[PDB]
Ligand binder design. Structure first.
Ligand SMILES: Oc1cccc2ncccc12
Length: 115
Protein backbone atom coordinates (compact mmCIF):
# COMPACT_ATOMS: atom_id res chain seq x y z
CA UNK A 1 0.00 0.00 0.00
CA UNK A 2 0.88 3.69 0.04
CA UNK A 3 2.42 3.67 3.52
CA UNK A 4 4.05 0.23 3.51
CA UNK A 5 7.68 0.61 4.58
CA UNK A 6 10.64 -1.16 3.00
CA UNK A 7 12.83 -1.94 6.01
CA UNK A 8 10.30 -3.92 8.12
CA UNK A 9 9.37 -5.89 5.01
CA UNK A 10 13.01 -6.80 4.29
CA UNK A 11 13.52 -7.73 7.97
CA UNK A 12 10.53 -10.06 7.64
CA UNK A 13 11.91 -11.60 4.45
CA UNK A 14 15.31 -12.22 6.09
CA UNK A 15 13.68 -13.98 9.05
CA UNK A 16 11.46 -16.00 6.70
CA UNK A 17 14.42 -17.05 4.56
CA UNK A 18 16.28 -18.24 7.67
CA UNK A 19 13.20 -20.23 8.75
CA UNK A 20 12.97 -21.86 5.31
CA UNK A 21 16.67 -22.75 5.29
CA UNK A 22 16.13 -24.40 8.67
CA UNK A 23 13.63 -26.78 7.05
CA UNK A 24 16.26 -27.82 4.47
CA UNK A 25 18.18 -29.78 7.09
CA UNK A 26 20.60 -31.31 4.59
CA UNK A 27 21.37 -27.88 3.12
CA UNK A 28 20.81 -29.31 -0.37
CA UNK A 29 19.21 -26.02 -1.49
CA UNK A 30 21.72 -23.72 0.22
CA UNK A 31 23.77 -23.04 -2.93
CA UNK A 32 23.19 -23.37 -6.69
CA UNK A 33 22.90 -26.88 -8.08
CA UNK A 34 26.51 -27.59 -9.12
CA UNK A 35 26.31 -27.40 -12.91
CA UNK A 36 29.76 -28.97 -13.32
CA UNK A 37 28.37 -32.18 -11.78
CA UNK A 38 25.03 -31.97 -13.63
CA UNK A 39 25.76 -30.83 -17.22
CA UNK A 40 22.22 -31.74 -18.36
CA UNK A 41 20.52 -29.68 -15.63
CA UNK A 42 19.92 -26.66 -17.86
CA UNK A 43 18.42 -28.92 -20.54
CA UNK A 44 15.49 -29.48 -18.15
CA UNK A 45 15.53 -26.44 -15.84
CA UNK A 46 15.09 -22.96 -17.30
CA UNK A 47 15.70 -20.93 -14.10
CA UNK A 48 17.85 -22.51 -11.37
CA UNK A 49 17.28 -21.17 -7.87
CA UNK A 50 18.73 -21.69 -4.38
CA UNK A 51 18.75 -20.00 -0.99
CA UNK A 52 22.07 -18.17 -1.47
CA UNK A 53 20.79 -16.60 -4.69
CA UNK A 54 17.57 -15.68 -2.86
CA UNK A 55 19.59 -13.95 -0.14
CA UNK A 56 21.49 -11.97 -2.79
CA UNK A 57 18.24 -10.99 -4.52
CA UNK A 58 16.74 -9.93 -1.19
CA UNK A 59 19.69 -7.69 -0.34
CA UNK A 60 19.69 -6.27 -3.90
CA UNK A 61 16.10 -5.06 -3.34
CA UNK A 62 14.70 -7.39 -6.00
CA UNK A 63 11.90 -8.64 -3.70
CA UNK A 64 9.41 -5.84 -3.02
CA UNK A 65 6.28 -7.94 -2.46
CA UNK A 66 5.74 -11.34 -0.95
CA UNK A 67 5.03 -12.99 -4.31
CA UNK A 68 8.51 -11.97 -5.56
CA UNK A 69 10.04 -13.93 -2.68
CA UNK A 70 7.69 -16.92 -2.72
CA UNK A 71 8.06 -17.36 -6.49
CA UNK A 72 11.78 -17.97 -6.10
CA UNK A 73 11.14 -20.37 -3.22
CA UNK A 74 8.69 -22.23 -5.46
CA UNK A 75 11.39 -22.50 -8.13
CA UNK A 76 13.71 -24.25 -5.66
CA UNK A 77 10.97 -26.79 -5.00
CA UNK A 78 9.64 -27.23 -8.54
CA UNK A 79 13.07 -27.47 -10.17
CA UNK A 80 13.98 -30.25 -7.74
CA UNK A 81 10.74 -32.18 -8.31
CA UNK A 82 11.21 -31.82 -12.06
CA UNK A 83 14.84 -32.90 -12.27
CA UNK A 84 15.00 -35.75 -9.74
CA UNK A 85 13.27 -39.11 -9.89
CA UNK A 86 10.50 -39.75 -7.37
CA UNK A 87 12.47 -42.53 -5.68
CA UNK A 88 15.30 -40.18 -4.62
CA UNK A 89 15.93 -38.40 -1.36
CA UNK A 90 16.34 -35.17 -3.35
CA UNK A 91 12.79 -35.43 -4.72
CA UNK A 92 11.36 -36.15 -1.27
CA UNK A 93 13.38 -33.25 0.20
CA UNK A 94 11.57 -30.91 -2.17
CA UNK A 95 8.22 -32.35 -1.08
CA UNK A 96 9.19 -31.89 2.57
CA UNK A 97 10.35 -28.33 1.94
CA UNK A 98 7.13 -27.51 0.08
CA UNK A 99 5.04 -28.83 2.97
CA UNK A 100 7.02 -27.47 5.91
CA UNK A 101 8.08 -24.29 4.13
CA UNK A 102 4.55 -23.52 2.98
CA UNK A 103 3.55 -23.15 6.62
CA UNK A 104 6.40 -20.70 7.24
CA UNK A 105 5.37 -18.77 4.11
CA UNK A 106 1.69 -18.48 5.00
CA UNK A 107 2.43 -16.99 8.42
CA UNK A 108 5.04 -14.63 6.96
CA UNK A 109 2.70 -13.37 4.22
CA UNK A 110 0.07 -12.70 6.89
CA UNK A 111 2.60 -10.52 8.72
CA UNK A 112 3.41 -8.67 5.49
CA UNK A 113 -0.30 -8.04 4.91
CA UNK A 114 -0.51 -6.32 8.30
CA UNK A 115 2.14 -3.83 7.13
O1 LIG B 1 22.94 -31.16 -5.93
C1 LIG B 1 21.60 -30.87 -5.88
C2 LIG B 1 21.00 -30.23 -4.80
C3 LIG B 1 19.63 -29.98 -4.83
C4 LIG B 1 18.86 -30.34 -5.93
C5 LIG B 1 19.48 -30.98 -7.00
N1 LIG B 1 18.74 -31.34 -8.05
C6 LIG B 1 19.35 -31.98 -9.14
C7 LIG B 1 20.71 -32.25 -9.14
C8 LIG B 1 21.47 -31.88 -8.04
C9 LIG B 1 20.84 -31.24 -6.98
Amino acid sequence: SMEMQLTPFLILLRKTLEQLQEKDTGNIFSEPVPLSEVPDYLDHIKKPMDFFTMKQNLEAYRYLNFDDFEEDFNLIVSNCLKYNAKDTIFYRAAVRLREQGGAVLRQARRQAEKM
